[PDB]
């Protein structure tokens, strides 16, 4: 299994956006020299639950400041963006870094954002799919030329052309059965989400296998990823209390149509939170449930920097 880190960049009234960004950079510098091999950036807009709306821009900075880690967008939302901008940017990151960028992308999880960006939700998946087509055409051929319900313009070279043959590596967020099936058909790797329940991640993993086999796609070599939150403290109760405060707004924003307590309790027990023992066991269970090959962890909920670095260290030693 390969291990990496991801950054949510959640802010609050106390932890400002300036502070979280600075913390992300410092963490990136810190782990670049360790065994973690990827640094991924989460995309969020208009709320405190994530201060980075342009993960590709942040990936550029992270690539310029590090030398070893692969840097990735964790869930760049293509559905609400112009696919030519996305392709150009991803290719640009691939070129500037000589292949150290990996393209984690996603469909839109917030209808509000689709509305914001004047994209109809009724044809969401169709939109998503046409976007990806344009991006992939560019990645694989250097050009694109759509004439569909959403984009129509003359054939163009999308510059710069990719540095990596076939474009940078891609992976898609497992956000719906629909996307999961689409990915299996294309043989694309998935990223299972820290905020989904283990039952839901297992369901997605199963569906992917089932669809791939059904269409005869060889996915024996696909490496899925899993994201998980990590918060370790010998006082396990203190770890869960701290993660609770950290996640409260997120659950209210992203899981509004579900019981708050129930959802919060599940996130706290399913993510790698609590004592070292609890945290590690949760992580083993989550990997087993979804069969991911690679694990991305977020250590951000630990407010104490020294404790956070010590936990990153214990994890690193344990890979190593």
């Amino acid at each position: 299994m390969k291990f990496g880190l991801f950054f949510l960049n959640f802010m609050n009234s106390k932890r400002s956006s300036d502070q979280v960004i600075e913390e992300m950079l410092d963490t990136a510098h810190y782990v670049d020299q360790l065994k973690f091999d990827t640094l991924a950036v989460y995309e969020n807009h208009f709320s405190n639950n994530g201060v980075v709306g342009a993960p590709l821009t942040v990936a550029g900075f992270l690539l310029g400041m590090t030398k070893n880690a692969k840097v990735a967008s964790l869930n760049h939302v293509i559905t609400t963006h112009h696919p030519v901008r996305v392709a150009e940017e991803a290719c640009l990151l691939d070129q500037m870094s000589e292949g150290r960028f990996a393209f984690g992308f996603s469909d839109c999880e917030k209808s509000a954002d689709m509305r914001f960006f004047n994209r109809p939700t009724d044809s969401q998946f169709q939109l998503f799919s046409e976007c990806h087509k344009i991006i992939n055409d560019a990645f694989t051929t250097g050009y694109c030329h759509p004439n569909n319900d959403f984009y129509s313009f003359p054939k163009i070279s999308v510059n710069p052309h990719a540095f990596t043959e076939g474009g940078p590596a891609q992976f898609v967020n497992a956000t719906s059965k629909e996307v999961v099936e689409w990915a299996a058909k294309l043989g694309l790797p998935l990223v299972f989400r820290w905020d989904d329940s283990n039952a839901q991640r297992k369901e997605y993993a199963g569906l992917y296998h089932e669809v791939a086999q059904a269409h005869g796609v060889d996915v024996s070599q696909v490496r899925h990823k899993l994201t998980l939150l990590v918060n370790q403290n010998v006082d396990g109760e203190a770890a869960r209390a701290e993660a609770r405060v950290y996640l409260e707004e997120f659950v209210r924003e992203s899981y509004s149509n579900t019981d708050f307590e129930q959802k919060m309790g599940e996130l706290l027990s399913e993510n790698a939170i609590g004592t070292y023992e609890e945290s590690t066991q949760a992580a083993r269970v989550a990997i087993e449930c979804c069969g991911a090959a690679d694990l991305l962890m977020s250590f951000e909920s630990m407010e104490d920097k020294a404790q956070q670095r010590a936990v990153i260290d214990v994890v690193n030693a344990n890979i190593v």
Partner: protein, 326 residues
């Protein structure tokens, strides 16, 4: 005196895209050592005229790789991208780099961009003005809302907050008198064209000052920039031939970009020739304008080695002698 290095990311006939991108990276990284305090990045789409379509992303890379170097766009084509996404980009650059990003903007010259990105080139002026007001609102207030003829969206919290009070410093490529006026009304510095002569530069600044003054800005403290095509060589004619040959290829590429779906005498009004010749041309402009920020493009020079050599000769034999207006 401040010095800027412009990178066009232009693809000359003799280089592949991959070579061009590697050179972009290397040139950016070598600028500070050559005495440049800022690197300026031009935006271009779908043609060899310039391979960098996303200068915010290239700026992020260069800023991540440095500590004290400032990096700017010269310039972002304002209208062709969502103003909210651009405000998020700028604030992220501002925050990550700790205030080293410089936000140069323009109306946009190529119809192809509007066509693909779905914007109406016919309204580029209105769009640039509109987008700027929305971004500035975000920079200043931390939120943005729109309900106009160009765009509409609900009030949203803009993340992250600006690092620089009022947002990253804005610079404007003023291609028209009206653009000059627009910049002056907001007290924004301009990046002057390298294809107009001293007289024209002084005129443009005179028009600008009239307006800025009326608005209450102190015209002596606005960071306007003089831009130049630069080729320094102890062999005058050599620099000139190289420059002329290069512009040949480059002008054609320009014309081609305008149709996908002046410059000639340039050498005479630019620092192209011996360092002494370069000093003379630039000082003439400083003297007439009072500008103290000199921005030069060295790509016409050849290979990366020749470009760097030219940069170093400018650094050793030009930079030290230029003087602020008396």
């Amino acid at each position: 005196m401040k010095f800027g290095n412009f990178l066009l990311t232009y693809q000359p006939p003799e280089l592949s895209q991959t070579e061009v991108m590697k050179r972009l990276v290397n040139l950016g990284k070598a600028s500070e050592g050559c005495g440049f305090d800022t690197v300026w990045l031009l935006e271009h789409h779908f043609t060899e005229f310039g391979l960098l379509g996303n200068p915010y992303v290239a700026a992020a890379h260069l800023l991540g790789a440095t500590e004290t170097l400032n990096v700017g766009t010269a310039a972002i084509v304002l209208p062709t991208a969502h103003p909210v996404r651009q405000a998020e980009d700028v604030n992220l650059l501002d925050q990550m780099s700790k205030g080293r990003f410089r936000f140069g903007i323009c109306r946009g010259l190529y119809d192809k961009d509007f066509r693909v990105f779905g914007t109406d080139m016919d309204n580029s002026r209105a769009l640039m003005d509109c987008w700027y007001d929305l971004m500035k609102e975000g920079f200043n207030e931390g939120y943005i809302a729109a309900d106009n003829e160009h765009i509409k969206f609900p009030k949203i919290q803009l993340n992250p907050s600006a690092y620089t009070q009022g947002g990253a410093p804005v610079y404007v490529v003023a291609e028209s008198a009206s653009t000059t006026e627009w910049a002056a009304e907001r007290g924004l510095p301009m990046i002057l064209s390298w294809i107009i002569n001293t007289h024209e530069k002084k005129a443009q600044l005179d028009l600008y000052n009239e307006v800025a003054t009326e608005h209450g800005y102190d015209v002596t403290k606005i960071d306007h920039c003089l831009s130049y095509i630069t080729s320094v060589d102890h062999d005058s004619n050599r620099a000139k031939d190289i420059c002329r040959n290069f512009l040949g290829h480059w002008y054609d590429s320009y014309v081609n970009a305008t149709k996908i779906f002046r410059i000639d005498y340039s050498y005479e009004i630019n620092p192209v020739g011996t360092p002494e010749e370069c000093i003379a041309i630039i000082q003439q402009d400083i003297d007439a304008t009072g500008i103290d920020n000199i921005c030069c493009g060295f790509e016409a020079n050849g290979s990366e080695e020749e470009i760097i050599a030219s940069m170093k000769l400018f650094q050793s034999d030009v930079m030290p002698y230029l003087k602020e207006k008396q």
